[PDB]
Amino acid sequence: HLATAEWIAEPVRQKIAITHKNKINRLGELILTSESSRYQFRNLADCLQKIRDMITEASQTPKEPTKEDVKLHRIRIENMNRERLRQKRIHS
């Protein structure tokens, strides 16, 4: 459980819940799975390192102008087109 976990700071919990919202189930539990190796030790180490990476990423909160992915290029194009197609009422 993310919110109930008091061993992490509250803003860090909120940022994790925002960014990693696709890994949170119905009950609010954050879930991380690993299948990268045949050994349970290595899989558990991978999961723990994932948790640590999430925590430190939330702590640092980078604000660099990161590169744009080719997959997101058409997504932003279609979003801009949808915004252009959005319309206003004559009388407000």
Partner 1 sequence: RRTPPLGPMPNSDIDLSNLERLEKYRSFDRYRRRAEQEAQAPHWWRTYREYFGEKTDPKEKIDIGLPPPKVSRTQQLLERKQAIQELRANVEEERAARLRTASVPLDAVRAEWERTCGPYHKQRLAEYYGLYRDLFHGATFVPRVPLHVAYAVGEDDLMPVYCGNEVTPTEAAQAPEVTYEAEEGSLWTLLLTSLDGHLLEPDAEYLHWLLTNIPGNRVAEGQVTCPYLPPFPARGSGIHRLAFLLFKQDQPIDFSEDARPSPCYQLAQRTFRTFDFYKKHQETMTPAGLSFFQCRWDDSVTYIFHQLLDMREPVFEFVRPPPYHPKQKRFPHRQPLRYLDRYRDSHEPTYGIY
Partner 2 sequence: GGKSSGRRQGIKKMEGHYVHAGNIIATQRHFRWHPGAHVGVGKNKCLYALEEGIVRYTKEVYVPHPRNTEAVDLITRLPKGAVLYKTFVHVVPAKPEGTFKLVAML
Partner 3 sequence: DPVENEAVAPEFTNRNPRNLELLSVARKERGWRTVFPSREFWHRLRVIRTQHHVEALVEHQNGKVVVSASTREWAIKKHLYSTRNVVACESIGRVLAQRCLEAGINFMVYQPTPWEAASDSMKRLQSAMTEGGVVLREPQRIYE
- What does the binding site for partner 3 look like in residue numbers (CB under 8 A)? 70-71, 73-74, 77-78, 80-81, 84-85
Count the residues of the shown chain that bind partner 2, applying the rule CB under 8 A.
5
How would you class 60 by CB atoms within 10 Å of its CB: exposed for 0-12, middle for 13-18, buried for 19 or more?
exposed
Q: Smaller CB distance to partner 3: residue 52 or 76?
A: 76
Q: Smaller CB distance to partner 1: residue 25 or 60?
A: 25
Q: Which residues between 60 and 89 bind partner 2 (CB under 8 A)?
A: none
**Alpha carbons 53 and 81: distance in angstroms, whole number:** 36
Length of the chain: 92
